Amino acid sequence: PRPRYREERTLVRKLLPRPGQSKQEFRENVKKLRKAFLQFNADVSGVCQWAIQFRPRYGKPAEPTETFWKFFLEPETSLPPNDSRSPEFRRLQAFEAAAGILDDPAFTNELRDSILAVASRPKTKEAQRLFSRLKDYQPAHRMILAKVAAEWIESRYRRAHQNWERNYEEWKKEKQEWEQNHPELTPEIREAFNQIFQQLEVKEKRVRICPAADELYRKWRREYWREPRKPVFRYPSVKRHSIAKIFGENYFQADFKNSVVGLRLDSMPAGQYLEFAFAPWPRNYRPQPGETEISSVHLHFVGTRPRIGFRFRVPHKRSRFDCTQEELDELRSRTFPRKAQDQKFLEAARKRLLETFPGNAEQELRLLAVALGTDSARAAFFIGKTFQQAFPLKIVKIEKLYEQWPNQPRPGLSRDHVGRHLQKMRAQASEIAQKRQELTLQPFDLRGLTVHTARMIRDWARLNARQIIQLAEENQVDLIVLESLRGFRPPGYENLDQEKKRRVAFFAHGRIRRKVTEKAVERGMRVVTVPYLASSKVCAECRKKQKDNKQWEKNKKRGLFKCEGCGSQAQVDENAARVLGRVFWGEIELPTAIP
RNA sequence: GAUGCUUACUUAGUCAUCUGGUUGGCAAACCUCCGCGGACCUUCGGGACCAAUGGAGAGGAACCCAGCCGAGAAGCAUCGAGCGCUCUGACACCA
Ligand SMILES: [Zn+2]
């Protein structure tokens, strides 16, 4: 499908006043830039507003404007595989004709007809004013703006909507099968119990009301009463991260021997730049400016301080596999997106991987099943379905890196550290509330403490990802096995509930998964995420699937355990790694304990 | 490795008992009401978002800005250790 994983890997450095430049002069310059960023965001938001109305609706006959929409979103498929001009240049030509700001054979007759249909539509007041302003812009700015709007609308609407469609079809089939297999006794009787809840304010799927004793209707409601929710569209809000202004070619002048960057604004003419100092390129960082030239510069604001991003090209490594990672993600996202659809997804993924292998996959498939625990973590290694050895990973960060916590708040990147900042926040927002009441949360209230906590969490995730990548590179792996854990929470997470602010301190296992997947696809590897199956409470040697629930947690609290059935003595992490490595193969099944 | 001076510098990459502490606020910044106009979802109750070459008030608790103290980056200057040279913790960066 779409090439989700590109080869860009952009790097962000903070901007600093140049030593020659005066501090007041630097404040005046960051003011000129803040204005340009605001204008760019406004223009992109307006163009997205104009273009969102041409989408083809689900369950309706196709309108004549659809093929222009698909050309605008994905010119690569629309254009022939070979053409001199880049696809984005063709996108700009189509957009100008559509908005009223094409005979080239690169464009098809259907595309021209659809754009003719599109242009013959009424323009709102916002659209007319936006196009009047956009007329004056340079073709480079117009093209960059159109590309950014297209990528934004694609990523933020179309992916989620297509996933929602595929989810909805399976929801139809599953509800039909459910209604036609066990409960044949509810053709209409559901209405009698539904009406009483309808007349009241019960606008929620999971009925947060305790059982009355229809309870079969209750299980039916929490499952198949309402359709899967449709994704809610938004625009590039300047309050959140939103998008980043792009200074393409001939607009930036970055120097590296000494770190100064020549940014150029839209109004500024040729040969004039705004020089700023920035954090110098790391020496140990593997790529260097000499290796690959910088394609463009991406600017965005955190808090009020500007940051810049350098975009360069880094080639990918060809994987021994004859398939892509996007297909493996596609299976789970679209083909099997449900809870019964997990066993089928895993079987299909295993088949697809095995058939794509050049030689004998069973004899030689270098596999590394990594589990992610709290204090510690270990990864198993498989070559041919035969366990070789388990490796420890150093993931506790203190004055030095260790593999385990040495023997009240633990110094270093720990739950205690994060939770102490969460408590500070819980004790500091109160007085803000009272003072605001006296005068008479927001995403600017504790704007330094939260950004610090976010940087801490992402640093922890980066540590985990790089450690895993290094372990995989040590012994030439081709496949990394990961679970679907949500994440861990710090001690102060629960006492700061009801606020999205507390989400800054969630440990984000998914962030680790994304980083690992990106870095693995970087090096010619594949990542498959099995569905959560609680590997910790499953013995690798014999699949006992322990359920004591009282003694197991105590054993995990000291890092050792003992299987109830036979008596294996391995540490919890090694057991879980072996369990995942087996589960990828056919030797262990998913619980599937829904009924 | 130690020591001293200077800097329109940093204290908003993380950790090492650590967004360092403190004093205040004209401009400015930040903050609160609208709201021309656009728009996504919706159980129609409402939720969420952008926005005028757009207009009105207000806090220095929070946001922002400035001063002071503590500290660290370097350019130079002294001595030293090891072997003139090498000489300042660990990690980590696809935002
Ligand atoms: Zn056992």
Author numbering: 14 to 114, 120 to 231, 356 to 549, 563 to 595, 613 to 767
According to the publication:
Cas12g is an endonuclease belonging to the type V RNA-guided CRISPR–Cas family. However, while most known type V effectors use this domain to cleave DNA substrates, Cas12g, the Cas effector of the newly identified type V-G systems, stands out by exhibiting RNA-guided ribonuclease (RNase) activity instead of cleaving DNA substrates. Cas12g, which is a thermostable protein identified from a hot spring metagenome locus, functions as an RNA-guided ribonuclease (RNase).
The Cas12g-sgRNA binary complex was formed by incubating the catalytically inactive Cas12g (D513A) mutant with a 139-nucleotide (nt) sgRNA, which was determined by cryo-EM at a resolution of 3.1 Å and showed a clear density map. The sgRNA used in the complex was generated by fusing a 45-nt crRNA with a 94-nt tracrRNA. Compared to apo-Cas12g, the REC and NUC lobes in the Cas12g-sgRNA binary complex undergo significant rearrangements, creating a central channel accommodating the sgRNA guide region. Additionally, the short Nuc domain, consisting of 36 aa and containing a CCCC-type zinc finger, is visible in the binary complex and was found to be inserted between the RuvC-II and RuvC-III subdomains. Additionally, a third zinc finger motif, the CCCC-type zinc finger (Cys711-Cys714-Cys735-Cys738), is clearly observed in the Nuc domain of the Cas12g binary complex and coordinates the Zn2+C ion. Although the remaining electron density of the Helical 1 subdomain II region (aa 232–355) that contains these two zinc finger motifs cannot be traced in the binary complex, the orientation can be unambiguously discerned using unsharpened density maps. Specifically, the region spanning aa 232–355 region of the Helical 1 subdomain II, which is positioned away from the core of apo-Cas12g, swings toward the central channel of the binary complex.
